[PDB]
Amino acid sequence: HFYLETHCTIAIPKGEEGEMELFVSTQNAMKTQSFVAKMLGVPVNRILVR
Amino acid sequence: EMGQGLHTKMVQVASKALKIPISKIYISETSTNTVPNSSPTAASVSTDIYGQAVYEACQTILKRLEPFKKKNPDGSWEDWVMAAYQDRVSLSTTGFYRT
Amino acid sequence: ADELVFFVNGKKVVEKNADPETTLLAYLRRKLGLRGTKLGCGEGGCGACTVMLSKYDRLQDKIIHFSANACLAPICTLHHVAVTTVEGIGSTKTRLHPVQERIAKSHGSQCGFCTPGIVMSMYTLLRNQPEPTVEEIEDAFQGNLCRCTGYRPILQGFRTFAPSLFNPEEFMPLDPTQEPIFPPELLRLKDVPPKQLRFEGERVTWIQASTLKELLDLKAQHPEAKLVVGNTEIGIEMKFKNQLFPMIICPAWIPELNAVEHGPEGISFGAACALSSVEKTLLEAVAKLPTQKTEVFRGVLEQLRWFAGKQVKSVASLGGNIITASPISDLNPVFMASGTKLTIVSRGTRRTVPMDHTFFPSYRKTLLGPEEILLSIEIPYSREDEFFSAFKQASRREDDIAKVTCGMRVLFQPGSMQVKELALCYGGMADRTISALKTTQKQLSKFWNEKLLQDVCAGLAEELSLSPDAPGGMIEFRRTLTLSFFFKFYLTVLKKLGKLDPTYTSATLLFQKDPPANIQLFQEVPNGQSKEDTVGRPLPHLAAAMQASGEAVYCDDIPRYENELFLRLVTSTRAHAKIKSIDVSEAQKVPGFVCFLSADDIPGSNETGLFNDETVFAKDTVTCVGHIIGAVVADTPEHAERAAHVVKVTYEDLPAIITIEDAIKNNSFYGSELKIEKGDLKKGFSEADNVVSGELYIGGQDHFYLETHCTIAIPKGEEGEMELFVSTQNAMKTQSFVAKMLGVPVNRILVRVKRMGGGFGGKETRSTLVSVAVALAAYKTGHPVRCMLDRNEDMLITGGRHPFLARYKVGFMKTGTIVALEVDHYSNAGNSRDLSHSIMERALFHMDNCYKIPNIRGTGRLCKTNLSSNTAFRGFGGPQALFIAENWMSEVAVTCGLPAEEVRWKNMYKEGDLTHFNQRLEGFSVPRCWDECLKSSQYYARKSEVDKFNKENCWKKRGLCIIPTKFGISFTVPFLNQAGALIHVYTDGSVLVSHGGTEMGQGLHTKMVQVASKALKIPISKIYISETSTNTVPNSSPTAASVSTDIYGQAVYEACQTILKRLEPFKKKNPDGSWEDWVMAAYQDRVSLSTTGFYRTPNLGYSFETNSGNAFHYFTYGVACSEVEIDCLTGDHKNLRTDIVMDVGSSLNPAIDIGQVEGAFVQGLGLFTLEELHYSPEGSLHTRGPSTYKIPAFGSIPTEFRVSLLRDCPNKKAIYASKAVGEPPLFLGASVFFAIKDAIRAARAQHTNNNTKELFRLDSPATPEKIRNACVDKFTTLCKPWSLRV
Amino acid sequence: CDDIPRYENELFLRLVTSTRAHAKIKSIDVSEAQKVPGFVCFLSADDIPG
Ligand SMILES: Cc1cc2nc3c(=O)[nH]c(=O)nc-3n(C[C@H](O)[C@H](O)[C@H](O)COP(=O)(O)OP(=O)(O)OC[C@H]3O[C@@H](n4cnc5c(N)ncnc54)[C@H](O)[C@@H]3O)c2cc1C
Ligand SMILES: Nc1nc2c(c(=O)[nH]1)N[C@H]1C(S)=C(S)[C@@H](COP(=O)(O)O)O[C@H]1N2
Ligand SMILES: O=C(O)c1ccccc1O
Ligand code: MOS
Ligand code: MOS
Ligand code: FES
Ligand code: FES
Ligand SMILES: [Ca+2]
């Protein structure tokens, strides 16, 4: 692909109820959200992808 | 937005639909807590489908503002919006499209 | 410099560059990233920063555990000390400690900001006593404040360590064997002798002396060096007095300064001994030694009971209190009266002198030389024929500064009543501890009798004079206390010498706790209700566990960006003046200084405020002390603070209008008179058998949310975008005000509110004062910027409840029936309009309370003054008007000579009646609450018991009063009664709910989740609410008017209905499928799982011009009966019992609602009896901290506290038949005020006069000063024109 | 994404990837990695909570 900006993610753990806010260079915030929630083992509503 | 100008096009669409300058419209980012269960931005259909979703959302807004426009036809977009707010009419809505 | 080595939660900390000025709190929060410990006041009075400290005590040979205020603990005092914070005992990520589990499940956590500190105070107690007694449990919180709960749930839940809202049987037992072990490494370090340490900071050098020799050598070389042990005085001087001590020597480690010796003359304590140690030792001595030998010890102990709290007493040293020599020291008067021996030393010298009047020559000074230090203190055993008393009277019993405090000793000739020695020493009557030598000298050789009492009182009245301008004011009260204390001493000695009049006995009794008794009654949910349907169930606040664990994130807990700067507001020190110039030359010299911001830096508009009558930054003129002129931005908060403090502003004073009286005289008002008039007043007064006129005043109130105002502003650098994290109840206004100041479209600003550690209306609008300033800083610097107000800034700047002055005239019949009422209200609005108008409107809407007044006229004027702009505060004008109403109603009863409850009942509205603003009262439940409260409170039976007590007691009286209340529900501004919600159902079926409301501890999100769960018929476990944000739900009204549950509940409900309608087709095609199945099916079929919800309260719109239209959607009702016991000699009082019956319709959550009732009630209790703000004549606030502003403490609540939610009273006007509960209960706190008034009448009937119909004025708050002064007697009288017309 | 300022306590992650096209992972030694200044931790499959 050689997108000038390579893959990048910033993950911010809130420390509450498994909440996490992520800033991601992605075209798929939905899958990023569900995949992160799946790995963490928390409901999808706890993960915010921006 | 990955450089294809999707937000630019959505603002253009929203502006045309609402009949207001693009300067009054803004798109800050894409987030899972504003629009959920979104398909990945792909297949070159983003303009197509989000354009429709944005279009529909705009139609809902126009319909809610219609009573105030009729009430004060010479008024400004700002006048109608404030009137709508003061009359406790929701100025927030979702838009959706299914090909 | 030496390395500072200590442990935090079992982890070793090696600080190679310890700065002597760094507090443990700052270190924990900024260096260790442990934000569970909070900053609530920085002055040791709130306990929010409470932590536990553990150390190996060499002299005791064992590990000791004690609590301490992290805000006052210098990390440099913690070498080889183990710290335990809330994070160190448990968490929701691992497992909650029993203390955390219980405070959470018992509903002892609302906003949660005070929870960690209370958890640590309780935890520390248990580490010392695994099975504490109820009294030990209450005493554990003398230094912890909670503004939300009313304390009852915290104590009742913790009582377990010694339908229902919670089940103790579910609690995990406490197992001491599973507690964290004392750091092994520290236990090893105990085997290596102490060595002197040196710490070098930016401005201070700290020397930890290991031996007495080193200490004396250091003092000889550096006489100026400031000793520091507990730092509970120096810490205050540094932080609040702008003091800077370049060199500090901590002698805490020195064995001689910690030695306890039991000698033949008394018990000696090293000067470094903590007050808690002195207390423990003296308690043991009193338990083992003969009563006659412990008179002085018990005096010391009595003072220690009311000396700060556990946190302060555990670190505060004996030497520190003595040498600080504060005019209000509670111990020096005792040490002086008892001639306590002081051993003073310096290199090469040693002397021992008994403390006497000469020890304190002048303000804050003692007779110690510059090279001398206090080594030890020997508190003397009392001798035969020698008696001692110690008394203290403040504004509040627990953790307060003495108004007057004393130590009194008398020595008689062997076996006689003839005085050999007499010492009456007082604190709070001069700029130093003094002895009434002139007075006592005259009694030597005299006998203990009535003549001596009279002579001493007359003497005290003359010798302990106070000039009208005496610091602290309360001249009459303080002088009365000096005599009253002696009277108590006199009577007590008579008793000890012995035949005392039975009715006089209680006057000699020391304060005694009565066992608590709490009962909560609510309605069980229908038998067939699903377990998943939690509506109506006592579900604990969803974030309670995280609040108890310190995991709950409040604004300042959010990590700072690496490039984040700090802002410090620069405010006016003048009430009204022209700003001639601003000099930042000195500020620019402070390290880390970035810039000074002022009006000219604003890119958009400097016009702000709800009514655009405010500046963001003062321009040309300042209109109140605290008026924001600008702000300093620096690399650290300390640097920002120091720089701001040296910004020099030159003023030219302008005539200032401070008081309501000033405003009236100068016709200084905001807008025109507000008025509601119904009936024919003229005719009404003609018909009246009696007419009473009067004036009444009700003081203001500081919100004192445990978490002060705070804003973090993140500039994005794109299109003017800015994201702000704010502690506000009004994200919409925050957003628009920031946008307005910046001059950018509102759509560029994003405001996010996770939660507030309390709001109470104080964060409805005034939070923008900080938000806009921080936003400007971010805009100008391009860096993230934050600012959290220190308590003193917050109390000075942000405004509070509106003080009200009322002039009334009421006409009534001999039967007590009201036929006419005129009340002119005046509120002190401050330097801007803000919410003052609506507040006055609500006041007018409630001037009737629950009584039908055929002819009534109420007016209101907003006084424009040079004081910080007052704003919304739980009640929003209602409490003031309701108070004024109950005041004349109480006078009508007295005038008619009829039982108050009878007069109130016969005047009470009836179902269907119209209010003075012509709204029909539908579902008027006051009658039921009234009769049920009368019954469950056993009002009548107790009424007679009260009269009996009063006949049997001359210097103590009891009062009982039952009052009703009704509170109109809805914003009195029509358009604010709208609410939006946004709900998303993700493909895993989990639901994210967002609504316009904010969480400030009231449990709104909890209720919304409960609502959503019921509406969707899915477990609450599948629903979540993360925060409130302007980009999810726009144009939201502020979270206020107690209608959030009502309106957001409907919006959430509607959104859920839409979701259900969309899922319906899939549920039908797969009836036996799961929620998850239907959701995925809908998603797969491309059905949107996202929708908004909206609600608009119908039929609202009142007009003051026509006195027509519905002002409220409905009313919330309640009744409260309170009984009190006042000490007619000191002004102190006990809240014996309070019974509340509240109508909250069908409660959505009885736990949260009873919590709101108790919390509101206690806040009202504070408003009417403890809380008072004092201002200089020039308009400068004196009361800027918990040390001087006394909110209700754990010990302030009714001993017997009963709350019942009215049964079978569904409210068809709101979500799931519930009723708003936020504000309605607050006024019921007035039941305490009127019980006190009743008690005072009994006292006046006893010693004042015989006029049983006298109407003495009692303004709010009914503080110890007002209560004592009202109890006119031979003492108040002791504390002459040429001619008089005949 | 990476232009977003880092938090004061923000850490950095570096992926450890396979140098073989197809093989069994016999063992992983991080004893040398742990010596690198600033090393916080090595994360692997067993660290995943979900
Ligand atoms: C929330 C709060 C509540 C309080 N409540 C009360 C109260 O009810 N009644 C009351 O009287 N006080 C009260 N205090 C005041 C304070 O706690 C006492 O004065 C305390 O005993 C001082 O002890 P310290 O060790 O903390 O002093 P520091 O602050 O460490 O030192 C105080 C002063 O004593 C000097 N000093 C200390 N030890 C020696 C020594 N051995 N020889 C010579 N000089 C010495 C120091 O140089 C300094 O000037 C309160 C303080 C707070 C913060
Ligand atoms: N714990 C806590 N309870 C509280 C408050 C608070 O700040 N903290 N605010 C009070 C005020 S002034 C109001 S208007 C209501 C607001 O919330 P509500 O509308 O959901 O009842 O809660 C009341 N109860
Ligand atoms: O309580 C109200 O009536 C009210 C009205 C306008 C704004 C804030 C409010 O609390
Ligand atoms: O469909 Mo484009 O993201 S290949
Ligand atoms: O209506 Mo509350 O925010 S005073
Ligand atoms: S912040 Fe420490 S006692 Fe309030
Ligand atoms: S819960 Fe205690 S102050 Fe809020
Ligand atoms: Ca105001």
Q: Tell me C559's DSSP state.
A: P
Indicate if C1117 and C1146 belong to the same structural domain. Answer: yes
Distance of CA B4 from the midpoint of ligand 4 (Å): 11
Find the CATH number of the domain harbouring C238: 3.30.43.10
Restricting to D residues 11-50, those with a Cβ less than 8 Å away from any Cβ of C are none
Q: Which residues contact C145 (CB under 8 A, 6 or more apart)?
A: C40, C45, C46, C47, C48, C114, C704, C706, C1186, C1191, C1193
C128: which 2 tokens?
Answer: 């010392």
Q: For residue C1043, give the ligand 2 atom closest to its CA.
A: 19
Which residue is closest to D11 within chain C, CA to CA? C562
Collapsed DSSP state (helix, strand, coil) of residue C373: strand
C158: which 2 tokens?
Answer: 């913790």
Q: Pick from A3, A27, A49: which is nearest to B41 by CB?
A: A27
Q: For residue C1222, give the ligand 5 atom closest to its CA.
A: 2
Q: Which residues contact C1036 (CB under 8 A, 6 or more apart)?
A: C731, C732, C979, C980, C996, C997, C1028, C1030
Ranges of H-type helices in C529-680: 544-549, 637-645, 660-665
SS3 content of chain D, % helix, strand, coil (to 5): 10, 0, 85
Indicate if C791 and C864 belong to the same structural domain. Answer: no
Of C68, C69, C54, C161, the residue nearest C106 (C-alpha): C161
- C560–D7 CB contact, under 8 Å: yes
- A48–B38 CB contact, under 8 Å: no
Exposed/middle/buried for residue C1000 (C-beta within 10 Å: 0-12, 13-18, 19+): buried
Which residue in this structure is represented by tokens 């011009």? C1105
**How many structural domains compose chain B?**
1
- Whose Cα sits closest to atom 40 in ligand 1? C374
Element (H, E) at C910: none
Indicate if C1145 and C1093 belong to the same structural domain. Answer: no
C271: which 2 tokens?
Answer: 């000067």
Question: Dihedrals φ, ψ of C612, to 5°?
Answer: 50, 35
Half-sphere exposure of C1190 (CA within 13 A, CB side): 25
Residue C46 Cβ contacting ligand 6 at under 6 Å: yes
Between CA C763 and CA C727 the distance in angstroms is 7
CB C568 within 8 A of CB C593: no
Indicate if C149 and C274 belong to the same structural domain. Answer: no
Half-sphere exposure of C921 (CA within 13 A, CB side): 25
Indicate if C1258 and C1169 belong to the same structural domain. Answer: yes
Experimental method: X-ray
| Ligand 5 mutation target, pool C1042, C1044, C1046, C1156, most atoms within 8 A of CB | C1042
CB C493 within 8 A of CB C408: no
Half-sphere exposure of C780 (CA within 13 A, CB side): 26
Between CA C467 and CA C307 the distance in angstroms is 28
Between CA C697 and CA C806 the distance in angstroms is 6
CB C1191 within 8 A of CB C1171: yes
Indicate if C998 and C1082 belong to the same structural domain. Answer: yes
CB C1054 within 8 A of CB C981: yes
Find the CATH number of the domain harbouring C351: 3.30.465.10
The catalytic residue among C214, C822, C1223, C1265 is C1223
CB C1174 within 8 A of CB C473: yes
Q: Which of A12, A17, A19, A39 to mutate to test the interface with C (most CBs of C within 10 A)?
A: A17
Indicate if C1267 and C1132 belong to the same structural domain. Answer: yes
Active site residue C1223: yes
Ramachandran class of C266: left when φ > 0, alpha when ψ lies in -120 to 50, beta otherwise: left
Indicate if C698 and C845 belong to the same structural domain. Answer: yes
| Ligand 2 mutation target, pool C708, C977, C1002, C1215, most atoms within 8 A of CB | C1002
CA distances from C388 to C300, C1020, D43 (A): 10, 62, 69
Ranges of H-type helices in C1137-1256: 1150-1169, 1230-1247
Indicate if C183 and C207 belong to the same structural domain. Answer: no
Indicate if C319 and C266 belong to the same structural domain. Answer: yes
Q: Tell me C509's DSSP state.
A: P
Residues of A with Cβ-Cβ distance to D49 under 8 angstroms: 40-41
- Looking at the CA of C700, which ligand is closest? 8
Resolution of the determined structure in angstroms stands at: 1.9
Is B43 marked within a binding site? yes
Residue numbers of the domain that contains C774 = 703-798
Between CA C1239 and CA C1246 the distance in angstroms is 11
Other CB atoms within a 10 A radius of the CB of residue C680 amount to 14
> Rounded to the nearest 10 degrees, what angle do helices C1230-1247 and C878-896 cross at?
30
Residues of A with Cβ-Cβ distance to B42 under 8 angstroms: 27-28
Residue C114 Cβ contacting ligand 7 at under 6 Å: yes
Indicate if C1156 and C1219 belong to the same structural domain. Answer: yes
Q: Strand C749-753 relative to strand C1028-1029: parallel, antiparallel, unpaired?
A: antiparallel
- C1024–A34 CB contact, under 8 Å: no
Between CA C138 and CA C459 the distance in angstroms is 40
Indicate if C821 and C933 belong to the same structural domain. Answer: no
Find the CATH number of the domain harbouring B33: 3.30.365.10
Find the CATH number of the domain harbouring C620: 3.90.1170.50
Residue C874 Cβ contacting ligand 5 at under 6 Å: yes
Which residue in this structure is represented by tokens 């609510």? C522
Residues of C with Cβ-Cβ distance to A14 under 8 angstroms: 553
Of C1094, C1110, C1085, C1102, the residue nearest C1056 (C-alpha): C1094
Of C739, C726, C812, C714, the residue nearest C765 (C-alpha): C726
Distance of CA C608 from the midpoint of ligand 2 (Å): 25
The CA dihedral of C38, C40, C45, C47, to the nearest 10 degrees, is -30
Between A and C, how many residue pairs show a Cβ–Cβ distance under 8 A?
A: 38
